[PDB]
Each structure stands twice: as structure tokens, then as C-alpha cells.
Amino acid sequence: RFLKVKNWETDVVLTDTLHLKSTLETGCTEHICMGSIMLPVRTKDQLFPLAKEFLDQYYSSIKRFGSKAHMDRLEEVNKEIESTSTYQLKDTELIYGAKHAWRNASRCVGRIQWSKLQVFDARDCTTAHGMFNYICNHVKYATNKGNLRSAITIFPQRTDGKHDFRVWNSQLIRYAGYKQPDGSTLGDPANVQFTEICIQQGWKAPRGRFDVLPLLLQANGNDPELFQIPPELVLEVPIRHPKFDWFKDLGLKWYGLPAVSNMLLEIGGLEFSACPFSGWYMGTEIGVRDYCDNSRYNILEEVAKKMDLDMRKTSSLWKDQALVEINIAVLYSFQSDKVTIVDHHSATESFIKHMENEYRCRGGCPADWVWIVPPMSGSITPVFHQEMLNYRLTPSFEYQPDPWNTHVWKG
Amino acid sequence: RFLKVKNWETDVVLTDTLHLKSTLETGCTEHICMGSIMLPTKDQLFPLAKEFLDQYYSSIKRFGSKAHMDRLEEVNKEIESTSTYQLKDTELIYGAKHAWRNASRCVGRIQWSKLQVFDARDCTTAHGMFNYICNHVKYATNKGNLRSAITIFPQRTDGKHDFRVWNSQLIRYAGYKQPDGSTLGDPANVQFTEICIQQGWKAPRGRFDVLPLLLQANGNDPELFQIPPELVLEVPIRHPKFDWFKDLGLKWYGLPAVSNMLLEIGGLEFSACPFSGWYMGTEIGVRDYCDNSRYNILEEVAKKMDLDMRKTSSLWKDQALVEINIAVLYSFQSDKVTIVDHHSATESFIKHMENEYRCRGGCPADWVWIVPPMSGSITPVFHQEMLNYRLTPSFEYQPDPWNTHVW
Numbered sequence A: 001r002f003l004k005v006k007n008w009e010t011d012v013v014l015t016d017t018l019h020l021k022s023t024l025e026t027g028c029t030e031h032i033c034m035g036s037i038m039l040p041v042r043t044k045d046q047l048f049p050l051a052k053e054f055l056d057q058y059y060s061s062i063k064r065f066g067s068k069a070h071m072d073r074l075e076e077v078n079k080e081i082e083s084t085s086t087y088q089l090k091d092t093e094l095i096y097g098a099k100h101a102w103r104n105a106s107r108c109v110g111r112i113q114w115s116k117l118q119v120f121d122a123r124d125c126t127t128a129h130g131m132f133n134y135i136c137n138h139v140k141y142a143t144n145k146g147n148l149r150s151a152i153t154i155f156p157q158r159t160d161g162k163h164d165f166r167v168w169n170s171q172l173i174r175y176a177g178y179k180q181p182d183g184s185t186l187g188d189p190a191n192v193q194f195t196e197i198c199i200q201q202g203w204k205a206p207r208g209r210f211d212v213l214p215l216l217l218q219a220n221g222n223d224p225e226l227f228q229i230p231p232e233l234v235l236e237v238p239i240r241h242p243k244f245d246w247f248k249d250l251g252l253k254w255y256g257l258p259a260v261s262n263m264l265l266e267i268g269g270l271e272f273s274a275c276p277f278s279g280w281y282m283g284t285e286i287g288v289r290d291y292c293d294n295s296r297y298n299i300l301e302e303v304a305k306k307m308d309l310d311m312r313k314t315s316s317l318w319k320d321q322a323l324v325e326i327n328i329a330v331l332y333s334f335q336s337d338k339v340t341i342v343d344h345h346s347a348t349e350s351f352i353k354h355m356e357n358e359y360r361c362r363g364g365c366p367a368d369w370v371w372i373v374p375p376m377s378g379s380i381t382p383v384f385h386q387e388m389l390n391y392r393l394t395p396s397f398e399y400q401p402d403p404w405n406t407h408v409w410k411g
Numbered sequence B: 001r002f003l004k005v006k007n008w009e010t011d012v013v014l015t016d017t018l019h020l021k022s023t024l025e026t027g028c029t030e031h032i033c034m035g036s037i038m039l040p041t042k043d044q045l046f047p048l049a050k051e052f053l054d055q056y057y058s059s060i061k062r063f064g065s066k067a068h069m070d071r072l073e074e075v076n077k078e079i080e081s082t083s084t085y086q087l088k089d090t091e092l093i094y095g096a097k098h099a100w101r102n103a104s105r106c107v108g109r110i111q112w113s114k115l116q117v118f119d120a121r122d123c124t125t126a127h128g129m130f131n132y133i134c135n136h137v138k139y140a141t142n143k144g145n146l147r148s149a150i151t152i153f154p155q156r157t158d159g160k161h162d163f164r165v166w167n168s169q170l171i172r173y174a175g176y177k178q179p180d181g182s183t184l185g186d187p188a189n190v191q192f193t194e195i196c197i198q199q200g201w202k203a204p205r206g207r208f209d210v211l212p213l214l215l216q217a218n219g220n221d222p223e224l225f226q227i228p229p230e231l232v233l234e235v236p237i238r239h240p241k242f243d244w245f246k247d248l249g250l251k252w253y254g255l256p257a258v259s260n261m262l263l264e265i266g267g268l269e270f271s272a273c274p275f276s277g278w279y280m281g282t283e284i285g286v287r288d289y290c291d292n293s294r295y296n297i298l299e300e301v302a303k304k305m306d307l308d309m310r311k312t313s314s315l316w317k318d319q320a321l322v323e324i325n326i327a328v329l330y331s332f333q334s335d336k337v338t339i340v341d342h343h344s345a346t347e348s349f350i351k352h353m354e355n356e357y358r359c360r361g362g363c364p365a366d367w368v369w370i371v372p373p374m375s376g377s378i379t380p381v382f383h384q385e386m387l388n389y390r391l392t393p394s395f396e397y398q399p400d401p402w403n404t405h406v407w
């Protein structure tokens, strides 16, 4: 069956056949849409089917479907599974897998870049120290002195689920948050709980507004260990405004490298529970969400206070007006320091071309509208007007519970 | 089956049970979410009637009473005998109120129960329709202090006798393609405006011409009526700080009045049921003025503001978008015409969700539509998980009548 999406701005109509390769569930039924819901050990039993699907895909992509190399590999994986109960990906399959998990990430607006991804194979890693070294190298390579490069580091796969590699941090680089006796938070309220675990695990907290958190690393199902990223490796950008000279005096900065470290990568039924990946920021992630969410740095008040806006009635749109300035400032700052960043007009335009290209070459592009539309100025971006179909393809990135909820302490 | 919705800003979790009364289907499956697609006989009628009368008699705390059974009996007998039935005024009013209560795309539902229902089921001619619509327009405008209203024309009979308002809204601006290649006035209405000209309308060929009504009574061919100009309240758009803004020559109408939808109550279909409330500011300032396919005024405004339009990253679009929206709100408040900003509206809707969750077990809500088209994440609805499902009575989209009419 064919499925058509419409763009209401351009009248362009696309036909999706790729959704037919969807297996995983959406959360929705014919009676309920869960489109705005945030979160909606395998046996050889289910494993070989998942292995076979993946290797068929992989072999198709390299124009070798049905080849002797294809059949041989199938046969080899088959036996490894029934013999060892799992299997090892070849390098080329790991790289292709990781590229495709990104490609299939329907909440990611940056996917025009999916084929340019540096994969680091950290499957020989055995210890937390080993994980720390791998992660440092990723940070350094990805940062590239401001000329950011997409990268992922892939640590050993789940085996019995009792020996998982995990990065406890949700991102490689984030700022500490400290809940105060008076109820106020210092630093980033999103990280209070993780900051507290770090402190518990022995970290001496500077207790400032922008303290880079230490890494908390679990290898082989062992208790996690703390490591501070060399400060010289953590690129940061002071935020100033092109026209407002007082903007610098708000004392704002942000780090350059958005690097997600809490997600699970699935390739051919194998589960990679520690697979940190990084790209570059879209300006709004920082300027809109990190700075302006009420549950985050919540700076709207101070900025509008400094801009002398009419703050008595919301209908003055003082919030909206301060929000644009904060975002101009983020983009200005990153650009001035030559740190890669994309604005939300440019990111969304690119995504639309990528998406159309995906329909032409691939028969679809799964896309989550709730996430793809930027959290400011929604309708003046082309994605607002774009009908999207959301469905789940593997390989994929999945959410996992935070490891402190599941971890069995060895002590 | 018992479902939770979380707000990520506040950690408030609500439990939805109302969805388990979900009647119609979504477009979504276990395999594919269609959350962002805009458009996803005697036998059938009696369960539809019963289900509705059950909810009605439940609402007036009389479920299982003799008056309940007696009406269920009467409607039964009426359907078997006549192949349809008529709602009592009370049932009609309850039904209209609930179609609004159930409109998952409507952010303004905190108001759902203050709705003026005008029963136009006695209407027989397009002139009658015009009279009814003028009175609606006048009552709702109320010299700028807008009041919610719906006017309900006769229900579908055999489908060859539909009442329809051909306009999508009671009040809209004409659109004309120019030899110049561009578009004059509102490009959204170009096709309708041609049909008006072709049915006789004499267009002033101006940028803000109020379209004529095109009214279809009893499945007959539609007729043209101009709404009395003195009933169409309009607002010139000025900025509280940019003196030059007025020179753009922008105005908008005060009355948002949807006239193209289908009201379904207890299985009955009211195909002409224009309804109206009041505007949320972003509807005009963000969508009507700034959509590339609409009045598309961003560039001209940005230029007057002398912003750096050289690169997208200066956020000149965003900067000008904000001003355009300050101006809409400012003008409406200055001319004392009801308008709500998106901060206030979405805040009201969060309070409404809360009431609906405790009082009713949920609230069908479509996030894609509820989150304003500007500054999404700084309004509380952005952070609010919502479940979308279809409850009856309902407003349903229906195809533009010109694609369906036998002339």
C-alpha cells in the first residue's frame, strides 16, 4: 500500500512505501493517537530473524543481495547464534548499522548529514578507564577546535543483560545542578539528580552555575566510576549579543558539543547500551529550551528586565520578544567563535530537501512532526506545513531507563 | 487501556479513562502515526441515537429514569417509522455544546459551555439562511465584545437536500490572480472568489474585500448575498511603537466564524452549522499575515524595520514575526474587540484539561494543533502530553461543496 503526505505551503505530494518495512510499534491504535507522548536479553529464537533482516538490508545496500558472500555471512551468523547465542558484527556492518540508526531517527531534523558519520569501534573496551579514554578521543575528534564533526563511539553489546556497558550521563557534556535549601536551583535544574549521584560517588562539586559534570562510566555491568573530562577538551562559548552590550553580563555560556550518551543502539537484534553520538547544535536547542524552559535556566525574566519590555501584560509579548534576542545571541556567539551551529530556518529547509530526497531514493522518510518543528517560530519554518509519517525502522536509537533505577550495586 | 499523560514542565500526571468511550477512528495504526496529516441507513442510526441519548440523560442525572426510557422508545419508534428523528431543543443545545467540548484541535474549549445556540431548523430558503446568518453575525460581534455562537440549519435528509454555506468562514477576504502573475488579497480564497464572480458577484478587486455569502438551502443551487457592511466589524492594524506600521494598510475582521464543517449529534448530520468565537492573536499575525501562501508580509515588514535580511541566522523573520503579532493584539485591544494572546489561551487550556481530567476522565487534544505556531515551547501546552481521540457529538471536516454539487 501507498501513503501520501502533503505540503500545505507548496502543494507537493509525496508517496511513502517505506513504511511497509516498519515492524516495531508506534504507541498509537485506530482509537488513540499517542503522537505527543514522550515515551510510548533476547533468545536466538527472535534473534536470527532480526539478524537475517539486517544482513539482507546490508547486502542490498552494497548491491550484493543473494551473493555467495551474502549466503556465507547468513550461514556464519546462523551458526554463531546457535553456538554462542549471539553474534559479532563485521566492521562494515557496524558502520552501516550506526549510519542507518541515525537515518531512521524520525525525531532528528539533522538527518541530511546521516551518511557523514565517524564511527568509533570501541568493542574491545573492557573497563571504565578504557571507556573514559575512548570518550575523551571522541570529544577531541568531534570538537575539532570548533569545526564540529559527527561521531559515534560503540561499546560492547549487551550479552546477558547483567554485564552492560553504560554511560550514566545523559549527554557527555552537561552542567551540574544543585538544589538549594531554599528551594531554588543553582546551575541546570535538569541535572540535579545526576549531579547528586556524582557527589555521592565522590565528585567535589565546584557549586557554580556552569560546572561541567564528570563522566560516570559503567563497564561490563560493574559499578560506575567517575572521571573528569580534561577541561582543555571541553569547548565552551560565552554568550554575547551583537547589539546589546549588557548581554555578556548575564554570565551565560554553553558547550559546543551536543553528545547524547543515554540511548540504546539496535543493529540486527544486537543491543549497544553505550553508544555515545554527537553532532552540532541547532541554535534553538540552547536559546529556546536550555535557556528559556521554566524548568531549565529560565532566563526570560532577566533578559526582558534588562531590555525594559512591558512585563505587566503577557499580551505585550515580552516573552516572545526576549526569546528572539536570546536566540540571536546564541547564534551570534557560536559564529563569532567559529563553532559550528545551524539556525532553525536553515536546519528545517535542509531537512525538507533531505526528506524529499529520501522519498525519491528510498520510498519514505519517517519523521516525527512534534519533534521536527522548532520550539519557536514554528509556522515560518517549512516543516510546520509538512505532513509527516512517523514509524519505526531498524537499525534504531531507543530510549533506555536511566541506569541508576535498574543497576544492581556490587558495592 | 488506562492511560497516563505527563506534563514535563510540572511533573503533573493525569490519567485518561475517557478515551475508552472513543467512538470514531484516528488514521493511526500500531505501525504508523498520522498525527500530522490534516485530513486522515436505519440500522446504523439507532445505536447512534441511543449512545447519544444515554450520554444526555446521564448528563442531567436521569440515566435509567422513565423519562430516559420513554424518549429512547419515542426515538426508536420515530426512526423505524420515519427513517430519522428530530432532536428536542434541549438535546440540540447539549449536542452543540459537546461537539465543541470534543473538538480536540480547539485550544479555546474552556469556554465550551457558554455557547449561544441558534436553532435554524425551521429555515427553508437561502434568504432565510442569509437572515439567520446576519443575526448570528450581529449577536456574536456584539459591538466588539464577542460572544460564542452556533446557528444550526436543517439536518441531512436523503443527502440530495443538504443545506450548506459555501464559504469556509462567514467572513473572509477575496483573492484574485493578477495578469502581473502575483496574487491580490488573500491567496487562500482564489478559487471561491472566482466561483463568486462566476455566480454574479461584482468584485471591487481590492486587497481586503469581504467575500459574499454563497448559501445553499435544501440541496438547491447556492445564492449570493452580501453581509451588511455595518455588520462586518474590522480592525485597522497599527503598532504601539512603529508609526510606519499603519502605512502597510493592514486590517483584519473581528469575527472568526467557521462555516464549512459538519455537526454530528446522535447520528444526525447538520451540514450547515456556522459557529464563531473570538480570535487567538497568532491566527491572524502568524498564519494569516506570515504564511508564504497567505498575505506573506514578513519581507516588507522586515525591510521597514531595516533588519539584516542578508542571512537567515540574524533571525529577522523571527524578529519581524514578533512585531506583527504585538501589532495585531495591540490594535484589537485598542478598538475594544475581544482577542486572546497565545500565552493566555494556552494557559487557559491547561486549566481546562485539568478540569476535564477530574470531571470527565480526560480531554481529547491534538498537540499538533494546540501548540501555537510561534514560541511553542514557552507556552505550557508544548510540555503537555496529550492524547488524541474522537468523541461524539463532533464537528467534522467536509469536502468543499463545489466538488460535490449537481447544478
Ligand code: HEM
Pocket: A098, A102, A105, A107, A108, A109, A110, A111, A113, A117, A150, A151, A152, A260, A263, A277, A278, A279, A280, A281, A282, A285, A342, A347, A371, A397
Ligand atoms: C549534525 C548535527 C545535528 C543536528 C543539528 C541535529 C539536530 C537534532 C535536534 C534539533 C534534535 C531534537 C533534540 C531535542 O530537542 O532534544 C535531534 C534529536 C535526535 N537526533 Fe539529531 N542532530 C544532529 C546530529 C545527530 C547525530 C550524529 C545522531 C546520531 C548519529 C542524531 C540522532 C538523533 C536522535 C536519536 C534524536 C532523538 C533523541 C531523543 O529522543 O532524545 N542526531 N537531533
Ligand code: HEM
Pocket: B099, B100, B103, B105, B106, B107, B108, B109, B111, B115, B148, B149, B150, B258, B261, B275, B276, B277, B278, B279, B280, B283, B340, B345, B369, B395
Ligand atoms: C472562544 C474563542 C475561541 C478561541 C480563542 C478558539 C481557539 C481555536 C484555535 C486557535 C483553533 C485552531 C484553528 C486554526 O489554527 O485554524 C481552533 C480550532 C477549532 N475550534 Fe475553537 N476557538 C474558540 C471558539 C470555538 C467555538 C465557539 C467552537 C465550536 C462551537 C470551536 C471549535 C473548533 C473546531 C471544530 C476547530 C478545528 C477547525 C478545523 O479543524 O479546521 N472554536 N479554535
Ligand SMILES: Cc1cc(N)nc(CCc2cccc([C@H](CN)Cc3cc(C)cc(N)n3)c2)c1
Pocket: A038, A039, A110, A171, A258, A259, A260, A277, A278, A279, A280, A281, A282, A285, A399
Ligand atoms: C546528536 C545531537 C545533535 C543535536 N543538534 N542535538 C542533540 C540534543 C539531544 C538531546 C539533548 C537533551 C535532551 C534530549 C531529549 C529531550 N529533548 C532527552 C529525552 C527525554 C525523554 C523523556 C525521551 C527521549 N527520547 N529523549 C535530547 C543531539
Ligand SMILES: Cc1cc(N)nc(CCc2cccc([C@H](CN)Cc3cc(C)cc(N)n3)c2)c1
Pocket: B038, B039, B108, B169, B256, B257, B258, B275, B276, B277, B278, B279, B280, B283, B397
Ligand atoms: C471558531 C473559531 C475560533 C477561533 N479563534 N479561530 C477559528 C479559526 C478556524 C479556522 C480558520 C481558518 C482555517 C482553518 C482550518 C485550517 N487552519 C481549515 C481546515 C483545513 C483543512 C485542510 C482541514 C481542517 N480540519 N480545517 C480553521 C475558529
Ligand SMILES: C[C@H](O)[C@H](O)[C@H]1CNc2nc(N)[nH]c(=O)c2N1
Pocket: A035, A036, A037, A038, A370, A371, A372, B008, B382, B383, B384, B385, B386
Ligand atoms: C509533550 C511533548 O511531546 C514534549 O514536550 C516534546 C514536544 N516536542 C519536542 N521537540 C523536541 N525537539 N524536543 C523535545 O524535547 C520535545 N518535547
Ligand SMILES: C[C@H](O)[C@H](O)[C@H]1CNc2nc(N)[nH]c(=O)c2N1
Pocket: A008, A384, A385, A386, A387, A388, B035, B036, B037, B038, B368, B369, B370
Ligand atoms: C502538516 C500539519 O498537520 C499542518 O501544517 C498543521 C500543523 N498545525 C496546525 N495547527 C493549527 N492550529 N492550525 C493549522 O492549520 C495547522 N496546520
Ligand SMILES: [Zn+2]
Pocket: A028, A032, A033, A034, A035, B028, B029, B032, B033, B034, B035
Ligand atoms: Zn498517532
